[PDB]
């Protein structure tokens, strides 16, 4: 492994690993922020004599193309010149292994062949920061024993060096004779001239062309001081002073020469323009363009008489082109031929030929477009996060808050609609608080009523997810918007509808020679064959539910769809693009037609499912410049053609071994995709799109991160990002295919391997990284069908991939079975080989170089610890002994071209400096990690509040979180945001690097609070309630003993190790019982199959359950709120609907809850938030459990009581005083008298589960809806409306257990008496009818087809007969899959589903009692 130093003339050294030719070379060190097209880039004649620092950290993914191949024009087929032009190459990471269809060899092999030196392993960002604003930074790549001095190659005539020595002819025989003056021309200049009918005579830089016959002249170049080419400047002068009026087109060096030849001056830029994201402005008509540039010399803006500036630089105000006021002479300083770079300025070549074809001294202005208008708005309605749709059900989207922010800045009055009263969106108090907020459902009735009342003239319907969109679309289509005179701001509804309907899209896109491949939903075999026939084979059939799924010909489609129609009514026929590269683009377009790509994402792995899961990386890694720029160009034409004014998302499928692509879809509303893109790049889409909808153009909006630059640009990422979904599963397995993606993680690295391993760890705390060793120490089965495990969906898929590599299955086979591009599989194999290396080493034999490298590819100290036989603490010690630590970098949007001084931060081992100072010494606030079941959006409310409490008292903050769906991860609302792991390791690194004053672990759910003790032992000041007490409060055995000592009752329990131990307890307290590794037991057999140390709690039936949410100070309760669950106490608990204040709890029970709490608070010395759960039966109060942290009910409680508990808690924790007089202390509570509050989940759905001692249908739930009402019954009906449901009125499906009949009959009659028609299955229906309760028989979904007297439930729900299902736990194992299906039908149809008898009762009573009655602008909130 040979090594070398890059040394700079300022003293700086960095050691690196040679992958080039192993020899020294000296030169000018430059940087370039263009991410793509390194093979094209390093053949740019412009780099002659220059050592190129690549901004992109991952170089060599595509190998090298065929470097000997010529086109029929005799130019290099794939390069921009005859060979490599850089003197040397500096990169962070070099891909040894490569994967492109055009690749013929490694980039290392190509560089050695060309005699060019290249070192990897150096900090290209530190270099950039050093080179930036320093005129000419000289340096050398030096190998030991090969010294070389510093030399400036720019003091010799580099134009001469790269210029053709003799005249060459290209496109011999064409009609239009173009003399091209070679000052370092790029091949694409030649290629684009010839394509437009030119015969191109390429002449030496000092050739005498003043007398040649020609139709047009072109001067194109790259390297060197334009001043040293004096002979050429003279020859141009002589043209200009002659009467020749043949069109003259200068590119880059052309601009410099042409300018010098007319009497202008050139300077060496102290800050050069080298990038693919360089913004220019056409002075003459105020149009903006994104350009590739590569020059460190510029033309002074004091031009001489006759000449005017044409293009100017938007970032730095330097000259970017010039024009003759009369004659057809012009120049651009940028490269319109790009290659690499954006294909946005090619029209300048058309312009050129037009100036030949006119030939009457026409001007440059004459053959382009000409000058042009914005909406006046006084009050905008913003539809916020809504309910669920009959399709894309399950989205959070609190980006309206950024929209509100945008509006306020333009003095636009704002009205926000969000039905959740405890929403993080409406928990803002500054520029992001709306002027007026309505807590109403997002439906046409309610938005119409808000319109009548508020009389807005603006609407934003594209920043509240799908439900909001459909609502404002519908409102447009009833003329409601036109009637009250409300504009749609941004993309129009016509445009939006064309994106939302597939057929309409397929038409609009056919208007510009773009094709979709229409998907067809079909109910028969012959219509499947018809659809297939229209699409063209191969094709994909997808069932609604659930090999995958593919038909190359009509034979197969029939066989497969025939199977499919024997289990369902409808299938979807689509074009098969499976195994193609999925790439997406985020695009922005303003009302002045400026258009920019902000981010791009490559799906790594779809995980064997459909959805919008997808392991994703940004930027894309495996595309060539050609492939990237084609798709970009296509995005921009589609987006222009749709008239997008705002953000768009456009997903492509790209054939993996060709340039064939197709457009999968377009979303002209904000999405998951667009949120990821904002956090990945630093570019605030939602905020910018809001400004755009007022009609403000991008160059007039500020780049919030940079400060100095505009939002009219394309970000440049000097890191890579990885995003992994968090699924709703909770166990690690190898069958089911309708899992929902309930959350996601994002991780930032400067190698793929670092990013990827962090992403893995963020996903779930018991995922160590990428290994073949399964979590929980489980072992691989010996019946293991490894091909299967790689093709079917599973929750240990990544482990299986790891195993397949480790078991020497080829990567080609893995690529074929997973569809994961082999480039990703190479990097994954590199991780597994490091682990093998490590396993053979120990604390002594392991070298600094091996450890450094392991950390640089994402190994945790824990992973290393398992290999070396150390513990984690010992491994950390070992590492710090060697001074191996990570580095704090900024995301700055521009790859360090301009410095950011906002603090959006990440931590990487691939660096040599930090990018910030550590003088703040602020208060750390740990975030919650990815949303999952149990842990939803409420802990984001808690974050915003705690952070705010610290901000408002002037305390410097440090925020840490890795959930990209969180409002709290906003660099504008804390001082330092680290977008980072919430592991012990990474939090120790940040806490100690910063020297944080303390750390708050209380306000982020379970992840940060489990770190209490480990943090405590590793030197962290944990604010509030001591981690020693947290350990005590959450050791069952210790907490139970404290409770006997305090004389506070609890249900008896016992940890057991044996079956006879278990059975003897259950006996001793009567059945039934509970379980853990929460599971139920009624009889001896469940117990029998689980451990093959289990905790056994006595179950109390018919019990109420109570949350006590509180704040302690020095052990005294200083705020509290008691809330009652609707549902009887049971295993379901963290998805219980809550009622505040209590409804059916004896007064003595309350006093006992209060007293128990006072005691618990004192026993554990609580100073901070905390929660306690209780069983209450009559007057018996039993404590269930105590969590020494904020609960999910904290926002609810706070917004109900008019007191921010998290704010009270934060103050207590930092020692700020808090006046107790108006807080809800135990002696003076706050009980609402005129209103009740309900907290319910936003979305709920069935899961078929899983361990299978019994097949069990469960409900799962996420999100929050919370409402006030006069009493609980109206609040519950408002909740129902607020989750997007219609209040039931026609009919009710009744599914109950046979044994539950006596207890249900009352409710059933009650429901029939309110005018509901009852449906049930035949046994139930009969029995209801038998008791004089009318009911219609229906059929179990299994038995559909076998009894035509009985209507199917799907028909009665399509009908509209059934608009509420009641489906209570049915332990009968025969009908479990049926009850799963009934539930599933209800949820996907969008009719309300009730699964608990108390919720059922609460509904029945509610309809008896009783949609614009219940809200009717009535007032609340104390
Ligand atoms: C190529 O990148 C990949 C592909 C698959 C996976 C993968 O196998 N999973 C599987 C699994 C760990 N996962 C989960 O959300 C998940 C997390 C925890 C859990 O049990 C507590 C179950 C899960 F499904 C994700 C879907 C990711 C991955 F982590 C990375
Ligand atoms: Zn420039």
């Amino acid at each position: 492994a040979q090594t070398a130093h890059i040394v700079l003339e300022d003293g700086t050294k960095m050691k690196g690993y040679s992958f080039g030719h192993p020899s020294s070379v000296a030169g000018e060190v430059v940087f370039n922020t263009g991410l793509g097209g390194y093979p094209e880039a390093i053949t740019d004649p412009a780099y002659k004599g220059q050592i190129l620092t690549m901004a992109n950290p991952i170089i060599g993914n595509g190998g090298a193309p065929d470097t000997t191949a010529l086109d029929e024009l005799g130019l290099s087929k794939y390069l921009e010149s005859n060979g490599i032009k850089v003197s040397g190459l500096l990169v962070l990471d070099y891909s040894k292994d490569y994967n492109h269809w055009l690749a013929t060899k490694s980039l290392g092999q190509w560089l050695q062949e060309e005699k060019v030196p290249a070192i990897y392993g150096v900090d290209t960002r530190m270099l950039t920061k050093i080179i930036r604003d320093k005129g000419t930074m000289l340096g050398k790549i030096e190998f030991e024993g090969q010294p070389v001095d510093f030399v400036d190659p720019n003091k010799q005539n580099l134009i001469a060096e790269v210029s053709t020595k003799d005249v060459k002819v290209y496109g011999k025989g064409n009609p239009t004779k173009v003399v091209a003056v070679d000052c370092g021309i790029k091949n694409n200049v030649i290629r684009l001239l010839v394509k437009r009918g030119a015969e191109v005579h390429l002449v030496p830089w000092n050739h005498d062309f003043t007398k040649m016959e020609y139709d047009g002249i072109l001067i194109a170049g790259g390297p060197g001081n334009p001043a040293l080419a004096e002979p050429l400047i003279q020859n141009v002068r002589k043209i200009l002073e002659s009467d020749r009026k043949e069109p003259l087109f200068g590119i880059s060096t052309g601009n410099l020469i042409t300018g010098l030849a007319a009497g202008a001056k050139t300077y060496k830029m102290s800050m050069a323009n080298r990038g693919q994201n360089q913004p220019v402005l056409n002075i003459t008509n105020k149009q903006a363009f994104i350009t590739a540039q590569n020059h460190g010399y510029a033309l002074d803006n004091t031009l001489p008489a006759g000449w005017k500036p044409l293009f100017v630089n938007v970032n730095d105000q330097t000259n970017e082109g010039i024009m003759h006021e009369s004659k057809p002479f012009f120049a651009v300083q940028f490269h319109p031929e790009v290659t690499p770079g954006p294909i946005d300025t090619e029209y300048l070549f058309d312009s050129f030929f037009s100036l030949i074809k006119k030939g009457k001294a026409t001007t440059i202005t004459s053959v382009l477009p000409k000058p042009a208008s914005r909406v006046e708005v006084s009050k905008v309605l913003i539809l916020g996060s809504g309910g669920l749709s009959i399709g894309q059900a399950g989205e959070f989207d609190y980006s309206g808050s950024q929209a509100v922010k945008a509006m306020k800045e333009e003095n636009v009055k704002t009205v926000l609609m969000n039905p959740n009263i405890a929403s993080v969106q409406t928990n803002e108090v500054g520029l992001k608080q709306a002027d007026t907020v309505y807590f109403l459902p997002i439906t046409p009735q309610f938005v119409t009523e808000v319109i009548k009342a508020e009389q807005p003239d603006g609407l934003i319907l594209g920043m509240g997810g799908q439900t909001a969109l459909n609502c404002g679309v519908e409102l447009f289509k009833r003329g409601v918007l036109k009637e009250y005179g409300v504009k749609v701001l941004g993309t129009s509804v016509e445009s939006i509808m064309a994106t939302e309907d597939r057929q309409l899209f397929s038409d609009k896109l056919n208007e510009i020679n773009e094709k979709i491949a229409p998907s067809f939903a079909v109910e028969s075999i012959e219509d499947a064959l018809k659809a297939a026939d229209t699409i063209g084979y191969p094709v994909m059939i997808r069932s609604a539910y659930a090999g995958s799924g593919i038909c190359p010909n009509r034979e197969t489609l029939m066989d497969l769809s025939t199977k499919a129609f024997a289990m369902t009514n409808q299938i979807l026929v689509e074009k098969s693009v499976t195994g193609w590269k999925e790439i997406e683009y985020e695009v922005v377009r303003d009302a002045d037609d400026n258009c920019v790509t902000v981010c791009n994402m490559e799906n790594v792995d779809a995980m064997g499912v459909h959805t919008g899961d997808s392991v994703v990386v940004a930027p894309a890694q495996t595309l060539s410049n050609a492939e990237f720029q084609m798709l970009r160009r296509t995005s921009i034409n589609v987006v222009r053609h749709l008239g997008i004014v705002g953000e768009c998302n456009i997903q492509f499928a790209l054939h993996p071994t060709s340039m064939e692509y197709c457009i999968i879809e377009v979303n002209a509303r904000l999405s998951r995709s667009s949120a990821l893109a904002s956090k990945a790049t630093g570019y605030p889409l939602a905020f910018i799109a809001a400004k755009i909808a007022l009609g403000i153009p991008l160059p007039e909006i500020k780049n919030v991160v940079s400060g100095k630059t505009s939002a009219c640009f394309e970000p440049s990422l000097d890191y890579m990002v990885t995003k992994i979904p968090r699924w709703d599963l909770d166990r690690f397995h190898g069958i089911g295919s309708s899992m929902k993606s309930v959350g996601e993680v994002m991780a930032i690295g400067r190698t793929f391997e670092e990013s990827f391993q962090k992403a893995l760890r963020m996903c779930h705390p018991s995922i160590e990284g990428f290994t073949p060793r399964l979590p929980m120490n489980k072992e691989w089965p010996s019946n293991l069908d490894l091909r299967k495990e790689l093709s079917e969906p599973s929750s240990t898929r990544i482990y299986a991939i790891a195993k397949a590599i480790d078991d020497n299955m080829s990567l080609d086979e893995i690529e074929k079975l997973t569809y994961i591009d082999k480039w990703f599989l190479y990097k994954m194999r590199d991780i597994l080989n490091m682990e093998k290396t490590l396993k053979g080493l120990n604390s002594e034999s392991m070298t600094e170089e091996t450890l450094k490298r392991a950390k640089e590819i994402g190994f945790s100290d824990k992973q290393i610890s398992k290999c070396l036989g150390l513990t984690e603490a010992q491994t950390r010690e070992l590492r710090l002994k060697k001074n191996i630590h990570p580095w704090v970098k900024q995301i700055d949007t521009l790859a360090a071209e301009y410095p950011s001084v906002t603090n959006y931060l990440y931590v990487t081992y691939n660096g040599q400096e930090h990018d910030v100072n550590f003088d703040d010494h602020g208060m750390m606030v740990l975030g919650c990690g990815p949303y999952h079941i149990g842990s939803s959006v409420e802990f984001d409310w808690c974050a915003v509040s705690s952070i705010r409490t610290l901000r408002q008292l002037g305390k410097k903050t440090v925020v840490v979180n890795c959930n990209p769906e969180t409002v709290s991860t906003d660099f504008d609302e804390c001082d330092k945001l680290y977008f980072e792991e919430l592991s012990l390791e990474r939090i120790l690194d940040i806490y100690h690097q910063e020297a944080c004053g303390g750390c708050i672990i209380s306000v982020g759910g379970q992840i940060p609070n489990n770190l209490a003790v480990p943090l405590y032992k590793n030197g962290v000041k944990i604010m509030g309630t001591s981690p020693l007490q947290i350990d005590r409060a959450e050791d069952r055995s210790i907490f139970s003993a404290v409770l006997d000592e305090l004389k506070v009752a609890q249900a008896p329990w016992k940890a057991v190790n044996t079956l006879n131990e278990a059975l003897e307890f259950a006996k001793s307290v009567d059945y039934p019982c509970l379980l853990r590794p929460m599971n139920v037991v009624f009889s001896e057999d469940e117990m029998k199959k689980f451990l093959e140390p289990v905790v056994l709690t006595k179950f109390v039936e018919g019990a109420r359950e109570v949350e006590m949410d509180a704040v302690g100070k020095d052990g005294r309760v200083i705020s509290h709120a008691i809330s009652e669950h609707v549902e009887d106490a049971g295993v379901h608990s963290g998805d219980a609907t809550l009622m505040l204040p209590t409804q059916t709890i004896s007064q003595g029970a309350i006093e006992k809850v209060k007293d128990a709490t006072r005691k618990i608070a004192k026993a554990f010395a609580i100073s901070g938030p905390f929660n306690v759960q209780f069983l209450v039966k009559g007057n018996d109060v039993l404590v269930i459990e105590c969590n020494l942290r904020a609960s999910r009910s904290f926002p609810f409680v706070s917004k109900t009581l008019g007191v921010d508990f998290i704010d009270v808690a934060t103050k207590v924790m930092i020692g700020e005083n808090v006046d107790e007089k108006h807080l809800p202390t135990l002696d003076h509570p706050i009980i609402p008298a005129d209103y009740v509050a309900i907290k319910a989940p936003m979305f709920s759905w069935p899961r078929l589960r899983d361990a299978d001692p019994i097949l069990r249908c469960e409900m799962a739930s996420t999100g929050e809806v919370a409402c006030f009402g006069e009493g609980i019954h109206t609040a519950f009906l408002k909740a129902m409306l607020s989750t997007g449901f219609k209040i039931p009125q026609k009919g009710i499906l009744i599914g109950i257990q046979q044994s539950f009949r006596p207890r249900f009959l009352g409710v059933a009659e009650q429901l029939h008496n309110e005018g509901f028609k009852l449906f049930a299955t035949e046994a139930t229906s009969d029995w209801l009818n038998a008791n004089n309760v009318p009911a219609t028989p229906v059929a179990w979904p299994s038995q559909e087809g076998q009894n035509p007297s009985l209507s199917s439930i799907r028909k009665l729900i399509r009908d509209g007969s059934i608009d509420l299902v009641i489906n209570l736990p049915n332990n009968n194992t025969k009908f479990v899959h049926d009850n799963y299906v009934i539930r599933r039908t209800a949820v996907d149809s969008g009719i309300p589903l009730l699964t608990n008898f108390q919720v059922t009762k609460l509904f029945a009573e509610a309809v008896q009692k009783s949609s614009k009655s219940l809200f009717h602008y009535r007032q609340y909130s104390a």
Side-chain angles (χ1 to χ4, degrees), residues 269 273 278 293 295 313 316 318-320 333:
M269 295 147 97
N273 294 179
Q278 299 291 296
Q293 297 193 35
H295 69 104
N313 199 293
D316 63 7
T318 64
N319 186 267
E320 293 301 328
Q333 178 65 82

Side-chain angles (χ1 to χ4, degrees), residues 412-552:
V412 179
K413 259 159 253 166
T414 50
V415 185
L416 183 58
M417 284 182 77
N418 196 319
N420 177 27
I421 63 92
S423 183
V424 64
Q425 188 162 48
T426 60
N427 189 45
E428 288 289 358
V429 283
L431 305 144
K432 302 198 267 149
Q433 188 183 233
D435 295 303
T436 296
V437 170
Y438 279 89
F439 293 100
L440 316 182
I442 304 308
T443 74
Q445 190 204 155
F446 288 110
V447 174
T448 310
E449 275 287 310
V450 176
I451 288 160
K452 289 168 170 170
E454 284 294 328
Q455 288 189 325
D457 43 290
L459 184 70
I460 306 261
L461 47 46
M463 305 205 201
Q466 186 65 52
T467 297
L469 193 72
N470 299 345
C471 188
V473 150
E474 179 67 50
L475 276 191
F476 175 84
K477 296 178 72 165
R478 302 176 186 181
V480 175
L481 296 179
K482 176 174 69 211
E483 187 164 35
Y484 302 82
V486 195
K487 292 142 232 151
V488 178
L489 308 188
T491 305
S492 81
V493 173
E494 287 82 359
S495 299
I496 285 163
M497 289 164 69
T499 57
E500 290 293 338
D501 165 31
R502 185 109 176 172
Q503 176 46 59
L504 260 159
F505 193 54
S506 213
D507 291 328
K508 291 290 286 180
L509 294 189
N510 277 20
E511 307 190 16
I512 58 169
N513 309 317
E514 289 287 353
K515 292 165 193 153
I516 296 72
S519 84
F520 287 108
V522 306
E523 283 114 50
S524 77
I525 293 138
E526 301 193 30
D527 204 57
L529 283 157
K530 190 169 202 216
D533 180 43
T534 354
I535 296 154
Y537 294 88
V539 290
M540 168 68 37
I541 61 164
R542 297 194 319 198
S543 197
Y545 302 110
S548 308
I550 173 164
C551 319

